[PDB]
Design a protein around this nucleic acid. Sequence first.
DNA 1: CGGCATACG
DNA 2: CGTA
DNA 3: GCCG
Length: 327
Amino acid sequence: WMPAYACQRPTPLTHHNTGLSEALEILAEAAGFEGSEGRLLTFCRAASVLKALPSPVTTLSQLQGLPHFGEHSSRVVQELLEHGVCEEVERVRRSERYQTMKLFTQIFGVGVKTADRWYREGLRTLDDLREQPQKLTQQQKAGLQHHQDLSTPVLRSDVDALQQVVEEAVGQALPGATVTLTGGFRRGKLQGHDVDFLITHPKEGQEAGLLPRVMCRLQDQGLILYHQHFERSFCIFRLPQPGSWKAVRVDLVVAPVSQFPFALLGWTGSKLFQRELRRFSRKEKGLWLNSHGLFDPEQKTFFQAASEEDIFRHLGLEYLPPEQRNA
DNA sequence: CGGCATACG
DNA sequence: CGTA
DNA sequence: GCCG
Ligand SMILES: O=C([O-])C(=O)[O-]
Ligand SMILES: [Cl-]
Ligand SMILES: [Mn+2]
Ligand SMILES: [Mn+2]
Ligand SMILES: [Mn+2]
Ligand SMILES: [Mn+2]
Ligand SMILES: [Mn+2]
Ligand SMILES: [Mn+2]
Ligand SMILES: [Mn+2]
Ligand code: NA
């Protein structure tokens, strides 16, 4: 009925089990904060299964046979069905550890391992970090300086304005180069916390060296509040606002046209969808997938793809448009 | 039991 | 280590 | 935590 991999089923952005999936994703996030990547994956996959269902789960019976639902995740759902609340989920939500790790890892430049060390050192608030600035990287300094703006949702109106600015710099850097919106906005999201663009050129090889030229041109237009210094740039952009501006996270990626379908697939997401697609590729088809290509390790050859549709066909999967990849 | 995606900065 |  |  329900296939076991997220890449085998459509998952829309909005669905019929929002509250249940949100609770399982709390437990997934908490597992990640404790270094338990296996438990994180199971809770993420269980949440995703619910997102793919055609109607609301009303009774425990309806979980029988669903993949990734065992004793633990089924108990979470049963408590939510019976009481409207899962005691374990609420305990996590309320915990100082969860709240502080969430706060710290949401900083650009701070991962789980840094947040955990800071937690163990007794630090709890952003102002605690600002009081010891010499212990921060340039990237963390930027993430902390801009943290408030970076916590404010990006709207689709913002995205269209940013895309025009990036296109202008890309056109000067290399006439004929193209700019494609990726990430969650390509999956149909109306808001996000960052904007992603994928840049290529129709003539293989002409894109070499492009990203430095693009960044220099954005920087001299005064639009770059932060960048590293390549084929991936993780920036903070200055975005105009009524009578002011706000900081926005923007990722710029370059790929040659031979790699573009793979890069588009990977950068469009969702994260879980791509992990599941790569898992499926390797475990079920014996092929190795990343955002550069698809490798047959037995013949030692790369698959040529001209489209995302090609890639799904290579893997024997029915095609899913981006708006159904919201695993 | 082992596995859990796979890259770049 | 961080980032996607 | 769950799957094969
Ligand atoms: O930023 C994200 O979450 C994405 O683009 O999928
Ligand atoms: Cl684990
Ligand atoms: Mn348990
Ligand atoms: Mn009860
Ligand atoms: Mn994104
Ligand atoms: Mn991004
Ligand atoms: Mn590359
Ligand atoms: Mn084991
Ligand atoms: Mn375990
Ligand atoms: Na972070």
